[PDB]
Design an enzyme around this catalytic site. Sequence first.
Site, mmCIF file in Angstrom:
data_model
loop_
_atom_site.group_PDB
_atom_site.id
_atom_site.type_symbol
_atom_site.label_atom_id
_atom_site.label_comp_id
_atom_site.label_asym_id
_atom_site.label_seq_id
_atom_site.Cartn_x
_atom_site.Cartn_y
_atom_site.Cartn_z
ATOM 1 C CG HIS A 61 -0.036 -0.116 2.510
ATOM 2 N ND1 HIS A 61 0.418 0.986 3.215
ATOM 3 C CD2 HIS A 61 0.392 -1.209 3.190
ATOM 4 C CE1 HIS A 61 1.111 0.572 4.262
ATOM 5 N NE2 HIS A 61 1.102 -0.749 4.269
ATOM 6 C CG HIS A 64 7.337 1.492 5.033
ATOM 7 N ND1 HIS A 64 6.793 0.427 5.718
ATOM 8 C CD2 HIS A 64 6.324 2.368 4.843
ATOM 9 C CE1 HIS A 64 5.508 0.651 5.948
ATOM 10 N NE2 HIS A 64 5.197 1.827 5.428
ATOM 11 C CG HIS A 91 5.648 6.264 5.452
ATOM 12 N ND1 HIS A 91 5.775 5.803 6.736
ATOM 13 C CD2 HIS A 91 4.505 6.984 5.420
ATOM 14 C CE1 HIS A 91 4.755 6.235 7.464
ATOM 15 N NE2 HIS A 91 3.972 6.958 6.684
ATOM 16 C CG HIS A 93 0.419 8.652 3.743
ATOM 17 N ND1 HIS A 93 -0.415 7.547 3.881
ATOM 18 C CD2 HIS A 93 1.217 8.658 4.842
ATOM 19 C CE1 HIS A 93 -0.083 6.890 4.990
ATOM 20 N NE2 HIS A 93 0.889 7.549 5.597
ATOM 21 C CD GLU A 103 -2.279 9.699 5.845
ATOM 22 O OE1 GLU A 103 -1.312 9.709 6.659
ATOM 23 O OE2 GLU A 103 -3.044 8.750 5.682
ATOM 24 C CG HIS A 116 3.612 10.521 7.672
ATOM 25 N ND1 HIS A 116 2.523 9.692 7.556
ATOM 26 C CD2 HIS A 116 3.133 11.785 7.644
ATOM 27 C CE1 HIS A 116 1.426 10.429 7.479
ATOM 28 N NE2 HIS A 116 1.773 11.704 7.535
ATOM 29 C CB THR A 196 -2.561 8.015 9.111
ATOM 30 O OG1 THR A 196 -1.646 7.605 8.096
ATOM 31 C CG2 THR A 196 -2.010 9.181 9.854
ATOM 32 C CG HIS A 197 -1.258 2.643 7.610
ATOM 33 N ND1 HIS A 197 -0.627 1.508 8.082
ATOM 34 C CD2 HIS A 197 -0.266 3.451 7.150
ATOM 35 C CE1 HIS A 197 0.688 1.633 7.948
ATOM 36 N NE2 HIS A 197 0.935 2.809 7.398
HETATM 37 N N1 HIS Z 1 4.503 2.963 9.045
HETATM 38 C C1 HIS Z 1 3.865 2.565 10.339
HETATM 39 C C2 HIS Z 1 4.913 2.562 11.466
HETATM 40 C C3 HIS Z 1 4.654 1.577 12.575
HETATM 41 C C4 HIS Z 1 4.972 1.621 13.891
HETATM 42 N N2 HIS Z 1 4.558 0.440 14.459
HETATM 43 C C5 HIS Z 1 3.996 -0.307 13.526
HETATM 44 N N3 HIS Z 1 4.050 0.352 12.379
HETATM 45 C C6 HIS Z 1 2.699 3.505 10.690
HETATM 46 O O1 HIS Z 1 1.639 3.635 10.034
HETATM 47 O O2 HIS Z 1 2.444 4.330 11.530
HETATM 48 ZN ZN ZN Z 2 2.232 7.698 7.476
#
Ligand code: HIS
Ligand code: ZN
Length: 257
Positions: A61, A64, A91, A93, A103, A116, A196-197
């Site tokens: 999706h 990273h 990463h 969005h 976002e 982010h 945010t996900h």
């Molecule tokens: N990229 C993840 C980072 C993360 C921290 N712990 C698990 N995932 C997030 O949406 O926030």
């Molecule tokens: Zn993010």
Amino acid sequence: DWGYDDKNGPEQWSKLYPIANGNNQSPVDIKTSETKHDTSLKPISVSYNPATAKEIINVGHSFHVNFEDNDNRSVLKGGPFSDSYRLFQFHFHWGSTNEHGSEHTVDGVKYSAELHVAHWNSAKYSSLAEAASKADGLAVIGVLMKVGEANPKLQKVLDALQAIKTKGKRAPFTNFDPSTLLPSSLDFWTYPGSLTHPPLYESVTWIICKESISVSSEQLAQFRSLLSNVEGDNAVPMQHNNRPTQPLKGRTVRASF
Ligand SMILES: N[C@@H](Cc1c[nH]c[nH+]1)C(=O)O
Ligand SMILES: [Zn+2]
């Protein structure tokens, strides 16, 4: 699993993650007439070591950029924080159209994408897995990306996408300091919120930069050219991966300025 389909997207998420409708959800709309200027906020200090850069991965999706997080070579400090926070990733969005890929929004205005830059509380916890679910476990700098002129600082990142075109694909990504992606002003808004996900843990103290960074319409096009399928399956471009803004539920967005 969960995704941004319409089958399995954000309006879908609360079935598996009831926290989706919690009180500290992200992203938010920041209303500048509703923000309290807090004079006790220190300036944002970032100090990253380009050698902590590790790998780039197509996560289905999104993608990273991960960093070596065994020590404190790369850290975030200052702002709202007493604790030093340890970089582990950055990463982006983006959305379907240039009109709304961000976002976070500011006074209703939707930007083209969002950076982010993600850190965990290495003072209190021993790892990211432990930190990830704690109220004070994660810090994320969000940077609004405004469509315009091409941004040269993106180059290394964009050049690397051809290596990790399909889901699961990864490759080394080394010698890069992502503080070079941040806008030259460090003025920021803060608030308590969440990932945010999914899993949407309310573990994040957000640092939203006031200044935007540039991106070009064709840079954005590269992001959406990434594929969410695995090699061999029909192509399914990663059109978008941004979540709608969420109710403040009583929280206060603080301004550093
Ligand atoms: N990229 C993840 C980072 C993360 C921290 N712990 C698990 N995932 C997030 O949406 O926030
Ligand atoms: Zn993010």
